[PDB]
Design a protein around this ligand. Structure first.
Ligand code: MG
Ligand code: MG
Ligand code: MG
Ligand code: MG
Ligand code: MG
Ligand code: MG
Lengths: 277, 277
């Protein structure tokens, strides 16, 4: 139902109503053009209104993953790519310069359209821009932005991962290993990504997944439960004790803690070789 | 040097060392099989050890996006797909059923391998599983996991944004609107994901991007700055006041606040028509 312009790295989706000169609306934080549609109706008798879903939002779709560096707070990839999207969009819709309005971060995209593709711009409006780079007090506002993101993404994550470990009674040596930062900045950003992904897409879905005790009894001859010798008292050992209680499936104790296969790989292997090998 | 198995929706990468019967190791929250390589070193004379990067982690890569519903906490797409990955890997490497060990969430994957693809399992070991579904106190453990994830992915965001709105003196009209929850659970999930994306990938990058007052003055004839009439005292209006003081570029007042285009679309359109119609 939405129009599409295929660009390098994305299919850009946009609403288009009206007749007349082109007027491109660039959204802020919500990312999507639908917030402009009530406005577009008031205007459709005077402009061909184009309301964009920026490529990372809404119905637009990336055709390749974001570059890993986009996570850096001084990355310029996305803002420049958004501006180039609007310029390519204007060129595809019009042989003349067009009207552009951006709001909030969308007004920042519009600033970059004017800077890098002024030939597509007839008139432009910046609705309540939050850019701080050229301000006398730029550093104050930049630091506030940096600190709020740090608070939410990193502080919120470290405090909740500590809460997980205490909720499950994880042994210190396990807690430490599992929350240990990566020795490189690229490793640390990956480690953040991978943890957020686990929190959002794995922990809840897997720990309440569809497994019953009957699934264990049907194949009890195949199964060994393993409890670490250095992780006693933790919730995962209680899960195994329950399985054992209800099914008779054996528990074999194995060196190390929750991470004993890396903590004590010699001792872990010996148990497995005796079990199976 | 990693091996590859091309499956539906992903290229599954794994380490393969040793010789004899296949023994697949399924990692937990770290997602990657390198954590088993010291253990593999100790096992490689008795087993062909296979240590998997689950498809969402490490050197594995998706070739199709995840389903939108994977974010839902009762989704079971990912655990079932992980389990299917292990099963196809076993059939690719061995004509005999194989040995399997998983730890932590990897042990839950192993559980679904036994449930759905028992034919590929010779023997299987569940090292310290944190699954709670079949426990007599499942509700306690399930609701604790749900609370902690919610805290991080949504509430730490909600609290940080309120302090951020006070720092920028965002008008109550706009704060209420920007933080109004969606009328659907899945709609609220998408809201939070969108805001978390903006937080990580947009606010810092865009607000400290490379725009100077010189970029404006080159084209002062094209530009209108817009301030809402219901968002007085907010930081984005201070940015427009600075640009106007330094360059003379006009500010035009327009109905509504920071989201004035959806708050008062008729009055917003009236001003834009005065400007460009
Ligand atoms: Mg190309
Ligand atoms: Mg909530
Ligand atoms: Mg920069
Ligand atoms: Mg002020
Ligand atoms: Mg008029
Ligand atoms: Mg005019």
């Amino acid at each position: 139902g939405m129009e599409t312009l295929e660009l390098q790295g994305a299919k850009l989706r946009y609403h288009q109503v009206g007749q007349g000169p082109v007027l491109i609306f660039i959204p802020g934080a919500n990312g999507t053009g639908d917030i402009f549609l009530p406005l577009a109706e008031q205007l459709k008798d005077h402009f061909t209104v184009v309301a964009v879903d920026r490529r990372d939002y809404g119905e637009s779709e990336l055709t390749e993953p974001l570059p890993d560096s986009a996570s850096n707070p001084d990355s310029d990839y996305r803002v420049k790519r958004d501006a180039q999207d609007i310029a390519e969009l204007a060129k595809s819709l019009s042989d003349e310069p067009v009207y552009i309005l951006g709001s909030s971060s969308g007004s920042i995209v519009a600033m970059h359209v004017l800077k890098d593709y002024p030939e597509v711009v007839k008139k432009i409006a910046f609705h309540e821009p939050p850019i701080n780079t050229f301000l006398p007090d730029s550093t104050y506002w930049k630091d506030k932005n940096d600190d709020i993101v740090h608070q939410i993404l990193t502080e919120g994550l470290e405090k909740g991962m500590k809460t997980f470990g205490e909720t499950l009674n994880i042994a210190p040596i396990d807690a430490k290993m599992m929350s240990q930062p990566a020795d490189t900045e690229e490793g640390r950003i990956e480690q953040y990504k991978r943890t957020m992904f686990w929190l959002e897409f794995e922990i809840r879905q897997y720990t309440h997944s569809n497994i019953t005790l009957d699934d264990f009894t049907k194949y009890s001859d195949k199964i060994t439960l393993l409890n670490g010798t250095d992780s006693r008292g933790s919730f995962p050992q209680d899960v195994n004790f329950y399985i054992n209680k209800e099914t008779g499936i054996p528990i074999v104790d194995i060196p190390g803690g929750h991470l004993g296969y890396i903590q004590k790989p010699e001792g872990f292997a010996d148990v497995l070789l005796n079990m199976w090998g």
